[model samples]
Target: SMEQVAMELRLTELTRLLRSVLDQLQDKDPARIFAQPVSLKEVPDYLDHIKHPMDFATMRKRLEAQGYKNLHEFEEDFDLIIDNCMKYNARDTVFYRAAVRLRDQGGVVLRQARREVDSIG
Candidate 1:
């Protein structure tokens, strides 16, 4: 119960903060700033590209192709995306851009338990 209450409080605070940020961004006219189609040809391909779930599959593929692979890798990439989205504050264009990419390829890679043990004994 305590954990649930804490989680609810945290979510509420975050929601409020996000609303404020969005309101400010809206007033600043960020919607028109990042309104531009991303040229798919410009970016390279990524491993998850095979799935062809979203627009940024090419770039996402490149991300998965890196030598390193793990949850940290995924978090780092997503954090960068969220940071960029917030920075641009382009809810109209960039939001869909990020959304499509994240939704399509988000679950392509998974975080496996480092020490998974089956209950054989």
Candidate 2:
């Protein structure tokens, strides 16, 4: 299908762009620059320390308190909020903005953590 082919091409381009960005981040020594597949094992423990302006700690607890045990569970709930709000015509943009902020902050923290882990591992 045309859409499938387009999606595949987009993904390939995204991957290529990501690789180029990572390459540019590497130090002078090529041997010291490589990628390590992230293990999310450290994420749960680190969640509590992820603080505000992008608070994932309280967000983590809120999700967990409501029985969201993993990212997929949280995502389902997040989608539910958007879905239900739009359906009722009571859409709160702030909710979506906060979610975006939290996600972006979490990504920043994860990248920092990965660098630290790879440095000493």
Candidate 3:
């Protein structure tokens, strides 16, 4: 699982970036989430960019081949994404939650259709 393999390293990197972004956020909006006045409209676009595409053959082997055995494990990565993103826009709970759910679900569906060509014959 490239995702699980990279989780720790990525989080370490993200932690530092998150701190800087949050700091800027505090300066723009001290009291509430809207203090910074960000364009919430971009939330969906940003989330879309983060989603990875899936190849059918590989996805079948990893996720569906297990018949749901590794389902929860797969979901952990997505949970992390949502949990982290929400940290920035806590006030826009509705939109953030929706965004996370779609991305997470998309990952699951994509993985289920992993491409045969992605793997060497």
The candidate that wins on lDDT is: 3
What is the TM-score of each predicted model, taking all chains together?
A: 0.29, 0.26, 0.25
Task: Give the C-alpha lDDT of model 1.
Answer: 0.38
lDDT for each residue of candidate 3 in 15-106, tens digit (9 for 90 to 100)? 44333323332333223332222333755564444443222222334432333322344345334444545654464576466545555555
RMSD of each: 15.5, 17.2, 16.2
List the candidate 3 regions with Cα displacement exceeding 4 Å.
1-84, 116-121
Give lDDT per model, in order.
0.38, 0.38, 0.40
lDDT of 2 by residue, 42-117 (tens): 4453334322211223333453343432334434433333333233232366544443444444455436544643
Q: Work out how many backbone clashes candidate 1 has.
A: 3
**Which whole-number lDDT from 0 to 100 does residue 79 have in model 2?**
39
Regions more than 4 Å wrong, model 1: 1-37, 40-59, 63-66, 90-121
